[PDB]
């Protein structure tokens, strides 16, 4: 499951986490097994005009 997220909320992708996206868009199970990968996308997913 892949998407793009704001920088300050990267810590919210974890079991038992509360925030803006944690309980409104994407919530992981408490017993989730697997891995999470986060990397930068400034050079491609950012525009000078926004």
């Amino acid at each position: 499951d892949s998407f793009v997220i704001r920088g300050d909320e990267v810590r919210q992708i974890a079991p038992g986490q509360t925030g803006n996206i944690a309980d409104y868009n994407y919530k992981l199970p408490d017993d989730f097994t697997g891995c999470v990968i986060a990397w930068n996308s400034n050079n491609l997913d950012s525009k000078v005009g926004g």
Binding site: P15, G16, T18, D30
Partner: protein, 49 residues
Amino acid sequence: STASALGKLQDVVNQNAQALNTLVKQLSSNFGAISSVLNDILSRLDPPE
């Protein structure tokens, strides 16, 4: 007239009552947790901790 002649049965009854009473009393103990009542710690903290 004279009392205290039936010590064995009274002792048995007292032992049973005391054991039940202390078993009930053990509920209020903390055991190192935040509180001795489940509802308070449920409504005060989210599940993960």
